[PDB]
Every structure is written in C-alpha cells, then in structure tokens.
C-alpha cells in the first residue's frame, strides 16, 4: 500500500511511520513545508501509525531528539512516538478490508487529514487548533496538547480496566475533533476502506 505523507504546515515536521515493533518503510524523514514523502506499507500491516514530530535535531547518524513524538531519538522510527502525537492509524487487509482512523488518545501535536487516494471510502480529519485551545492542565511544555492518560496516569483516563467513560478532558478533544478517537472506549470513528486502498496523510490540511 502506498501512503503519500504531505506536510502542508508552514513549519518543518519529521514524519514517522511505525507498527510499534518495527519501522514502516524507512520509518522517518524530514518534511520541510510543502514536501511529500511516498512510503510503501506492507499489505496486512496491523496497528500501523503515522505521525508528525516537531522541533527535531538529528546528527549525521540519524540520532537526536524531537520536542513532540520522539521515537527513542531516532530519525528513522522503529517504535511509537512520545506523546503528544496526533495519530493516523491503520490496519490493512484485515479480512478483505482496510481500517483507518485518526486518534487523539496519545494527545495532539499537529493537525492532520488521513484520506484514501483510491475509491470506496471517505477520509477523516482532525484539523482544529487543539494546541491553541488546549486545557491548561494538558498543555505540554515541550509543545502540543497531552491526553489525560499521559498526564495523570489513572485507570479512568488510561482505561486500564476496560471500564472507563468519557471525561472532561476526552470531551475537549471530541468537541474540537468529533472524527478522531478521544479516549480508548470512544464510539469508533474508524472508516472501512476496500482492502489494499492507497492513502494520503496531510499535516496542517487547512493551513
């Protein structure tokens, strides 16, 4: 499956793509404003994620740090990123269909649109100014808007027991972005696409 990752932000981002225990394609790359990076994701990839990282520094060996979404200090991510990270999530070729969503369960750093470039389903978007509107207690000093589980580490926010409800904090993400997961047990906003669809993830789709 091909994913075109486009940075429409006015600032550079360092895109990242991982399935948690491995990189997807090269795993990460710098995307200056307007740049597009096309990756190939193996069919059948389950639990794949694409995200942006902000304010990164990398040396000649691809080691450094990002203010948001750092993945163990690597330019080429092999693991998931440090919250806050807006997430484009996908599971491909799952019983003949692909499943995509956007999630704010690990917070929000950059606005995103995640849409198919092929026929048969719609895209999803979370493009509201969640960092600007972020509740004081969720603001990440390093940048972004943390989810409540990251900040408070409670069973209710982390949905540890599988018995959690929405919260004042999850409702904030849901109000700004109805089409993204706001907490683990949110009413799903997953979109079913034809198996083997292709996609585009656009950072800052509106600006």
From Swiss-Prot:
<dbReference type="Pfam" id="PF00314">
    <property type="entry name" value="Thaumatin"/>
</dbReference>
<feature type="disulfide bond">
    <location>
        <begin position="71"/>
        <end position="77"/>
    </location>
</feature>
<dbReference type="InterPro" id="IPR017949">
    <property type="entry name" value="Thaumatin_CS"/>
</dbReference>
<feature type="disulfide bond">
    <location>
        <begin position="9"/>
        <end position="204"/>
    </location>
</feature>
<feature type="disulfide bond">
    <location>
        <begin position="134"/>
        <end position="145"/>
    </location>
</feature>
<feature type="disulfide bond">
    <location>
        <begin position="149"/>
        <end position="158"/>
    </location>
</feature>
<comment type="similarity">
    <text>Belongs to the thaumatin family.</text>
</comment>
<dbReference type="InterPro" id="IPR037176">
    <property type="entry name" value="Osmotin/thaumatin-like_sf"/>
</dbReference>
<dbReference type="GO" id="GO:0031410">
    <property type="term" value="C:cytoplasmic vesicle"/>
</dbReference>
<keyword id="KW-0776">Taste-modifying protein</keyword>
<feature type="disulfide bond">
    <location>
        <begin position="159"/>
        <end position="164"/>
    </location>
</feature>
<feature type="disulfide bond">
    <location>
        <begin position="56"/>
        <end position="66"/>
    </location>
</feature>
<protein>
    <recommendedName>
        <fullName>Thaumatin I</fullName>
    </recommendedName>
</protein>
<feature type="disulfide bond">
    <location>
        <begin position="121"/>
        <end position="193"/>
    </location>
</feature>
<dbReference type="InterPro" id="IPR001938">
    <property type="entry name" value="Thaumatin"/>
</dbReference>
<keyword id="KW-0732">Signal</keyword>
<comment type="function">
    <text>Taste-modifying protein; intensely sweet-tasting. It is 100000 times sweeter than sucrose on a molar basis.</text>
</comment>
<feature type="disulfide bond">
    <location>
        <begin position="126"/>
        <end position="177"/>
    </location>
</feature>
<keyword id="KW-0968">Cytoplasmic vesicle</keyword>
<keyword id="KW-1015">Disulfide bond</keyword>
